[PDB]
Design a protein around this ligand. Structure first.
Ligand SMILES: *[B]([O])([O])[C][N]C(=O)/C(=N\OC([C])([C])C([O])=O)C1=[C]SC([N])=N1
Ligand SMILES: [K+]
Ligand SMILES: [K+]
Ligand SMILES: [K+]
Ligand SMILES: [K+]
Ligand SMILES: [K+]
Length: 263
């Protein structure tokens, strides 16, 4: 609804930085509303969902096992690894690593998973192979969060990310069991409270993944809908703002409140 674009454009005004947005019908794939849908924005941690998508694809093909255990060390740890820093002694399984990467946005967990698939180059090849000729991962944690202005490395477009998430959650790309595992991890997301979740009505469903990076970068991808079932996909990205993390969270939350009100 146009009233939500009032809030989205107001957000760009208030943050003094570009905001990208897109609301997509989950079933039909129809773009319901958008703003700067085909401009690039740093993906930040939202790529962790595509990473686990690639891992689940390998699992389905018999090239990976969710129960496989990976051992790592203190020197493997990078900034913000709330879960992995607690399992140095006995390691973690691939499944436990995706849970940490998606639900807590654990950076070391993401790097360990990236390593299992061949690195950023292979995640990007996986994406292109499934029809996303825009989204690209080029670096590892922490560098992929640099958000250099005009840099295409580690970026996506709101439209491309929405379509990709749609295929990942509902297409034949992944088996039913695997696609459910992916959305189960997103639904259990624990670090995106101040965002869309703060505007979700009682009884509604949401599976999401947030992101934060340098230069005011913030964003979130989500599948949400009434009566415990997702029916639309929402993608919101912003970069360039000098606003505080709270101000950025509030704007995303207010965009959420508007799209819910006009559902
Ligand atoms: B992903 O985008 O969620 C990974 N994000 C981060 O590692 C960064 N911040 O995450 C914490 C510390 C949890 C936060 O408070 O948002 C991050 C990387 S570069 C930067 N300025 N922030
Ligand atoms: K509409
Ligand atoms: K429209
Ligand atoms: K160890
Ligand atoms: K330990
Ligand atoms: K900063």
């Amino acid at each position: 609804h146009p009233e939500t674009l009032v809030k989205v454009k107001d957000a760009e005004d208030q943050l003094g930085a570009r905001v990208g947005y897109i609301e997509l019908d989950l079933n039909s794939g129809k773009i319901l509303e958008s703003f700067r849908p085909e401009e690039r924005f740093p993906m930040m941690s939202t790529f962790k969902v595509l990473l686990c998508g690639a891992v689940l694809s390998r699992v389905d093909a018999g090239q990976e096992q969710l129960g496989r255990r990976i051992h790592y060390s203190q020197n493997d740890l990078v900034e913000y690894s709330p879960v992995t820093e607690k399992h140095l002694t006995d390691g973690m399984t691939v499944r436990e690593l995706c849970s940490a990467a998606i639900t807590m946005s654990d950076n070391t967990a993401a790097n360990l998973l990236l390593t299992t698939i061949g690195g950023p180059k292979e995640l990007t090849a996986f994406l292109h192979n499934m029809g996303d000729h825009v989204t690209r991962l080029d670096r590892w944690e922490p560098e992929l969060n640099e958000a250099i202005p005009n840099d295409e490395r580690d970026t996506t477009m709101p439209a491309a990310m929405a379509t990709t998430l749609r295929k990942l959650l509902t297409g034949e790309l992944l088996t039913l069991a695997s696609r459910q595992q992916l959305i189960d991890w997103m639904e259990a997301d624990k670090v995106a409270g101040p965002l869309l979740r703060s505007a979700l009505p009682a009884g509604w469903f949401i599976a999401d993944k947030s992101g934060a990076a340098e230069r005011g970068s913030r964003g979130i991808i989500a599948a949400l809908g009434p009566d415990g079932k997702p029916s639309r996909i929402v993608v919101i990205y912003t970069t360039g703002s000098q606003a505080t993390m709270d101000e950025r969270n509030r704007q995303i939350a207010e965009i959420g409140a508007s799209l819910i009100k006009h559902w």
